[PDB]
Design a protein around this ligand. Structure first.
Ligand SMILES: OC[C@H]1O[C@@H](O)[C@H](O)[C@@H](O)[C@@H]1O
Ligand SMILES: Cc1ccnc(C)c1
Ligand SMILES: Cc1ccnc(C)c1
Length: 150
């Protein structure tokens, strides 16, 4: 059984978060509607939460259960071009199917960062996690966000 949990969650009921969609790996704004933990044993004291969220722009998907690694405070600060560097882990916009076009917001690890006379080159390992897309050219180099880690 799922038990409602009021203490362990970093995020609380009614709070808005970014949540990572289980099917395609991008982050979307969502509201936390419930926070739960697995029931403890009868003979064990209470002392990792499951968040239950509803996406702001996709209410038709209903309430969805999220691992704690797939919920975080809403992105709010851009890392400007001058401050980006290889090895940073960031949230950026990429379209895996049409890479020249606007897409969705994914975690990424910067793999190349160079400015030449001709171009500002930013490459990153995108959809970081299982089957990440390695060394992708990033178009939207002025819209790279810091990941919030409260
Ligand atoms: O977390 C549960 C939810 O996961 C979603 O991916 C499914 O589309 C829903 O049918 C389901 O209720
Ligand atoms: C457009 C889109 C795609 C995948 N997941 C969500 C929540 C929205
Ligand atoms: C642009 C943006 C800002 C904050 N969160 C997300 C998912 C996207």
């Amino acid at each position: 059984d799922m038990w409602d949990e009021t203490e362990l969650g970093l995020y609380k009921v009614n709070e808005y978060v970014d949540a990572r969609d289980t099917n395609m790996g991008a982050w979307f704004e969502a509201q936390v509607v419930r926070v739960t933990r697995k029931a403890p044993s009868r003979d064990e004291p209470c002392s990792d939460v499951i968040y239950h969220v509803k996406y702001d722009d996709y209410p038709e998907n209903g309430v969805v259960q999220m691992n704690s690694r797939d919920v975080r405070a809403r992105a709010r600060t851009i890392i400007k071009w001058q401050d980006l560097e290889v090895g940073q882990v960031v949230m950026l916009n990429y379209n895996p199917d049409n890479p020249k076009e606007r897409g969705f917001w994914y975690d990424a690890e910067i793999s190349r960062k160079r400015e030449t006379r001709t171009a500002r080159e930013l490459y990153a390992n995108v959809v970081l996690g299982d089957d990440s897309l390695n060394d992708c050219r990033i178009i939207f180099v002025d819209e790279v966000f810091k990941i919030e880690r409260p």
